[PDB]
Design a binder for this molecule. Structure first.
Ligand code: ADP
Ligand code: MN
Ligand code: MN
Length: 287
């Protein structure tokens, strides 16, 4: 890409490993001038096979986003056979990590959903579709802020290409129209958000115990998933609104920000530090 840079160690220092994605490794790093800690995702292009398309899309999309709800991009650097993607450091854990110690309460679910919705509204307003919304791609800072991550399969709508049709995403969270490879748009992310709402409430998405290939026919054919159990009616209705088989009947992210579930339960993001501290304790006491 046009603004690819070189000699990253002139400006940054690579520190300890903090994550592993699908293809590359993520490290903590630090800006040598401001001493601000950052995250560095390092990709070995020599290892890169047919995932290279996704690396270029990730950098392109990150570089074009400027929102408090999307991992901030600092730049991409070439270093021998590797590519360093430098981004905002988020040290609180992903929403999936934060589910490990135990269930969330409805205030936690509504607060995390509300922040994800602000990220989706930003992306959709930029004509971008994330296409891989799930708890593992929702990252929190150590202080409770919530941001969307992992843009390798994001789609871009344009003035003439008003729909996408590529089969991409993570099966359990994929909308029926994406699985069928029908023309789709940002509403596909609203279906994935409904699945993520169930994931935040139950700890796993519907069908999580089946092989993902099986869900390729269960999803289009079956009735949409619902949330059953001791959950407030508004949370079940928030899930139902998102999980409509007809995309045009799903609400937009902006409309969902005013859903009764969000309005009556979401609280300040700073309260999420209790959840972040629970994961830290949990992880330390872990056998
Ligand atoms: N900005 C970041 N700050 C802190 N940890 C991060 C950051 N980006 C990625 N990670 C760590 O890397 C993991 C996988 O990242 P992701 O973007 O989902 O990678 P991939 O495209 O290689 O699968 C995250 O789930 C997290 O544990
Ligand atoms: Mn991911
Ligand atoms: Mn990715």
């Amino acid at each position: 890409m046009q603004n690819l840079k070189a000699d990253p160690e002139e400006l940054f220092t690579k520190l300890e490993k903090i994550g592993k994605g699908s293809f590359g490794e993520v490290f903590k790093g630090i800006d040598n001038r401001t001493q601000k800690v950052v995250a560095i995702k390092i990709i070995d292009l020599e290892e890169a096979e047919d995932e290279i398309e996704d690396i270029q899309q990730e950098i392109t999309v990150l570089s074009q986003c400027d929102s408090p709800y999307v991992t901030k991009y600092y730049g991409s650097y070439l270093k021998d056979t590797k590519l360093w993607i430098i981004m905002e450091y988020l040290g609180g854990g992903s929403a999936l990590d934060l589910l490990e110690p135990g269930p969330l309460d409805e205030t936690q679910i509504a607060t995390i959903l509300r922040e994800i919705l602000k990220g989706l509204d930003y992306l959709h307003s930029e004509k971008k579709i994330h296409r891989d919304i799930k708890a593992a791609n929702v990252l929190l800072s150590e202080h409770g802020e919530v941001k969307l991550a992992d843009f390798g399969v994001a789609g871009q709508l344009t003035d003439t290409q008003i729909k996408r049709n590529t089969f991409v995403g993570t099966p359990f969270w994929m909308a029926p129209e994406v699985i069928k490879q029908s023309a789709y748009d940002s509403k596909a992310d609203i279906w994935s958000l409904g699945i993520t709402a169930i994931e935040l409430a139950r700890g796993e998405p519907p069908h999580s115990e089946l092989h993902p290939m099986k869900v390729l026919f269960l999803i289009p054919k079956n009735n949409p998933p619902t949330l059953e159990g001791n959950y407030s009616k508004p949370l079940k209705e928030f899930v139902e609104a998102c999980l409509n088989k007809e995309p045009s009947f799903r609400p937009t992210a902006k409309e969902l920000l005013k859903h009764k579930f969000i309005l009556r339960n979401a609280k300040k993001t700073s309260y999420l530090t209790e959840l972040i501290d629970r994961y830290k304790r949990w992880k330390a006491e872990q056998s």
